[PDB]
Amino acid sequence: AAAAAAAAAAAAAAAAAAAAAAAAAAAAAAAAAAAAAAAAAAAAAAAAAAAA
Amino acid sequence: AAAAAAAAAAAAAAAAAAAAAAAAAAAAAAAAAAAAAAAAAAAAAAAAAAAAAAAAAAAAAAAAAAAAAAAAAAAAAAAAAAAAAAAAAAAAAAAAAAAAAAAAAAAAAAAAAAAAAAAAAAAAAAAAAAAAAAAAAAAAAAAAAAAAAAAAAAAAAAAAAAAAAAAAAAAAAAAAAAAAAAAAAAAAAAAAAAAAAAAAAAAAAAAAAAAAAAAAAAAAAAAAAAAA
Amino acid sequence: RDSKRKIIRDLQKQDIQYVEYGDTRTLIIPTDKYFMFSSPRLNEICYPGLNNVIRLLNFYPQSTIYVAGFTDNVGSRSHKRKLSQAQAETMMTFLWANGIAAKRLKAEGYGDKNAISDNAIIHGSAQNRRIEIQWF
Amino acid sequence: RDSKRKIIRDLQKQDIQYVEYGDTRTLIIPTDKYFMFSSPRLNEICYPGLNNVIRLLNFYPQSTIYVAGFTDNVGSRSHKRKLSQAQAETMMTFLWANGIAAKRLKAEGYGDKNAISDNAIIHGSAQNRRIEIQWF
Amino acid sequence: LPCRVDGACDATIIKMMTDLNKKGIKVASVGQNYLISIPASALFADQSPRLNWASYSLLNEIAAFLKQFRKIAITVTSYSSKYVSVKRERALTLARSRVVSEYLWSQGVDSRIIFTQGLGSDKPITSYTLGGDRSPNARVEITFRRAV
Amino acid sequence: LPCRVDGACDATIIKMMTDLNKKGIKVASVGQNYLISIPASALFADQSPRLNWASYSLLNEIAAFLKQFRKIAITVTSYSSKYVSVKRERALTLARSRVVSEYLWSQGVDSRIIFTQGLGSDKPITSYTLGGDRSPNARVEITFRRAV
Amino acid sequence: KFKKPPINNPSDDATIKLAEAAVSVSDSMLEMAKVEKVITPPSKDNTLTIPNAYNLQARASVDWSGPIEELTARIAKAAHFRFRVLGKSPSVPVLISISTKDESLAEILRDIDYQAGKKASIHVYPNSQVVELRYAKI
Amino acid sequence: FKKPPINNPSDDATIKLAEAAVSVSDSMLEMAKVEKVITPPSKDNTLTIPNAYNLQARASVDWSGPIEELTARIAKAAHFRFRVLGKSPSVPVLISISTKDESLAEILRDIDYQAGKKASIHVYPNSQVVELRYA
């Protein structure tokens, strides 16, 4: 239940509140995850966080 | 005084009177719907310069870009704005959905304001004594002056933050690169450790960095961020 | 006794430089005595320098404020930059929290890239470790 | 002269510790002078410490009583446990037989598993050999 | 020559120990486990992780008392009464204890470790729960073991 | 024997430094970067690259102040307010600074380089633009770094 | 009255020449560490093998120069983690010397783990409560 | 009123000495970061804790010597059978455990560890057998 952006690998997420970053090179566009408010978009392939 | 149609009205600076229960879905391009009661609108519109004002019993669901928002008594909005927002409320409740850029927000009353995406550059939020703002996507310079007995909750990942709480306010901030905090008899909760943090507490004031212990990888306070 | 010449005379006494320069006015604050060591924690025992510098810049309530941080030759260039940036940034928050409006202020850290003395000598590098405060 | 400050002052005089701690109150009784040696026989010559500790805990007639026994590093762990258990258990029977109702009391023996000093030194192990009396 | 006293005297130890118990900082002395218990009224402001300026004098004979012993690890742990939640409370008491241990290794301890932590009224020494930092439950405690 | 003083004393350095600040030639002293700032009223005639005869006394304690330091490169740079154009202005300030550095290495500096240049009000220290050489923007500045 | 800003204490020439040796060995140190980190990239940290825990998120400050056993036993004792070793200790002591102030226990164990490089390693198993210290095979 | 720190770098040389101390000490740490190569815990090769109730009994052993004999004995102290697969060489695989009280599953973890790759231990707890393997 995310909301990706069209740029290089940014995605907001509305489980509670997130604006995290993907990689967009392995292309894990599953659109199905357990998004949490501890910076963890745990998708079907791997897990994504607010990158820094 | 209902008005519920899907057409091209498209030129209406409509300062409507009371009991104007207009659930219109028309293509209102040059729109300013300053209704005074009973608005129950569920549209799919496009405005792009809307200086909307809404008085009591205004439930709305719109996919149109606005420019300014005003609340008077009590409301429940769900709007998808795009470009800029000058917002002010009075004892009401409001929710917004899409990516907005709220430059200034002044809430001097009981305002339950929520925005599911705020992608701005310098969000100055001034709060006075009753409100509850919950706006969280990504700012670049947040200035939260809570002069207030009120609450400013945020998971807004701001790059620079400057939050000053004046008299038993409660602000929940999250700073990416720059954290700036001053508290006075109040509470400032830091939900993310910044790249450089600085917090000053006044009399009976609590700038407690209340991050969740046992994260997956909670980054420790480094030599540039270890403040007392 | 409450004025400019009094407060600059005792900032000479608690060893902070001031320069008058046209419109540009610059305080040079030593980080070695106004910060606890290699940290952005302010040297809390030296509060009357901090109250006296903020008492000085109530006198200029419309000028934009440049604040900049400086180190010397030790450490990595990243450590120089982040330590100078952290100390300038927390002095900027000190002035903001002692009541200057936040869009007057500008915090920026130089890893001794301006370098008002040489770092090859002890007392010269002690002079290099500083905060400059400029305004107009 | 019949009160709390008098009886704690002379338990200082016959060398039993007391701690006030919120609601928790704990007597530390040395087994080395209040027991005959390596035995659960009470040191019968030191009766006025025993009368004074029971005179102290008439003052708290509703608190549950934890009593626990302690040794030091010598002997087998079974000998540590059974000797500490035997000494705590017979101090528990002393308080029960001097008139505390038996479901207020709790005897338990630790083979120095709390260890308020190190056992590597003589006077420290002498401090480790004890009975704690806690109540609320 | 080897030194007789190690920068400390036993008369000064019991002089500070009587003076701290007269000012209400209670020094328990069990074995070689030493406890000094400090009410959070006597150091901080209420529900804040911030020292008062006068309370560093209280920390002065705390640190000059901690001069006197050979010690390996001081642990400093803080806990207060309930204010908002246990999560806000444990953040408060962790910041509370880490601030007072930052001042204690600014000052003189000859400890090798100070462990420092805070709890959320998880260990309260009385059942009487009057208020905020004026509660006698609301306290920091500095416990160590005197080495040899 | 090796020499204690190098033809200079620190009492004379601060004596000239107070006297130059009393006559209005402002000596800034930052680190070892030394700046003496001279208004162009106090040396030249207006909009001219020509010294007045009395202003070589002002250059006398400028040069006797520059005796006192070990220095590698003095740079002298001059700039005034706008008179005709920036091209005429930069020719004026280049001739201005090269004339005062010609007198300064006629006099005693122990500098190895004097760099000398002029600018066309490109760096003005106030926004108040009263006139010609009576402007406080209209100035020459002599900056160096004192070596060791 | 003229004054430069830092008027510090009188230092002596002992720490003058100690300091200006210390900066040359510091810059030779960081140019070496720059070379090593560029021509093998660090693959991986030790946050996967020492992960943090609630009740490991206490903090400590430590100066220490002894062997690793006593320090890691004291860290785990005040972490309420059961401490054990794997492997027997070598006859030469693996000596660490931690001089830090206000770091969390998890990152302190990571610094201990790094400072005893290729002689021991610290592992923390946080769904249990164990801190183990394992020696090398040599 | 508060104080400055006692061993504080309060002095224009000692600050330079101590900033170089911080610079050398952290530059030591990322030297340690680059040559400290690790195991991942999903690929650590060592034995787990085999969570059987006979293997969580509470034992005590002081020994140096050849591997098979402590493992035979902790099988019969654990009421487990003992299988050996492989051939023990002419030099024996030598360990040392001297622990005055710990748990005997963690014996077998330190056994597998101090064997290393000269030998290995598995255990199958449904069949209640410890096996020792060579290579």
Question: Which are the contacts of D17, defined by CB distance < 8 A and separation ≥ 6?
Answer: D27, D28, E30
Distance CA E89, CA F83 (A): 70
Do the chains contact at C118 and F32, CB–CB below 8 Å? Answer: yes
Q: How far apart are CA F105 and CA F103, in angstroms?
A: 6
Maximum distance among all alpha carbons in chain A?
A: 26
B206 vs chain E: nearest CA distance in angstroms? 5
**CA–CA gap between residue E18 and residue E24 (Å, rounded):** 10
What is the DSSP secondary structure assignment for residue G17, as one 8-state letter? H
Q: Which of B35, B62, B58 is nearest to B46 (CA)?
A: B62
d(CA D134, CA F67): 84
Could you say which of C20, C24, C128 has the minimum Cβ distance to residue F31?
C128
G63 interaction partners in chain E (CB closer than 8 Å)? 112
- Which residues, 6+ apart, have CB-to-CB distance to C32 below 8 Å? C126, C129, G6, G8, H12, H15
Check: CB of residue F119 under 8 Å from CB of residue F137. Answer: no
Residues 6+ apart with CB under 8 A from G45: G110, H33
Alpha helices by DSSP H, listed for chain D, are 4-13, 31-34, 47-56, 77-97, 122-128
Contact G3 C17 (CB under 8 A): yes
Contacts of B94 (CB under 8 A, 6+ apart): B69, B71, B75, B76, B77, B87, B111, B112, B113, B114
Chains G and H touch (3+ CB pairs under 8 A): yes
Q: Whole-angstrom Cα distance, residue G104 to residue G77?
A: 15
- The shares of helix, strand and coil residues in chain H, as percent rounded to the nearest 5, are 35, 25, 40
Q: What angle do CA B73, B75, B81 make, to 5 degrees?
A: 125
- Alpha carbon distance D92, D66 (integer Å): 9
**In 3D, which of F108, E129, H82, G102 has the Cα closest to residue B221?**
G102
Count of other CB atoms within 10 angstroms of residue A2: 20
Main-chain phi, psi angles of B163, to 5 degrees:
-115, 120
* C-alpha closest to that of C74 among G15, G9, G11, H27: H27
Q: What is the resolution of the experimental data for this entry, in Å?
A: 3.5
Residue F77 corresponds to which tokens in the numbers above? 């740079």
C-alpha torsion angle, residues H69, H74, H80, H85 (rounded to 10): -30
Chain C residues interacting with chain F (CB cutoff of 8 angstroms): 17, 19-24, 28, 116-118, 121, 124, 127-128
User: Which residues share a beta bridge with D29?
Assistant: D131
Q: Give strand ranges (E) for B9-101.
A: 11-12, 30-31, 34-35, 40-42, 50-54, 58-61, 66-71, 75-76, 85-89, 93-96
CB pairs under 8 A between B and G: 18
Of H36, H41, H109, the CB nearest to G117: H36
Tokens at residue G138, please?
């040599």
Residues of C in contact with H2 (CB under 8 A): 44-45
The Cα–Cα gap between D52 and D18 comes to 12
DSSP label at C47?
H
Tokens 């507490």 sit at which residue? Answer: B201
CA torsion angle for G114, G116, G118, G123 (degrees, to 10)? Answer: -70
Q: How far is CA H118 from CA D109, G59, H67, H87, in A?
A: 46, 41, 10, 11
- DSSP for H40-71? -GGG--S------TTTTSEEEEEEEEEHHHHH
Residue C125, chain H, CB below 8 Å: the answer is yes
H94 in contact with G, Cβ within 8 Å: no
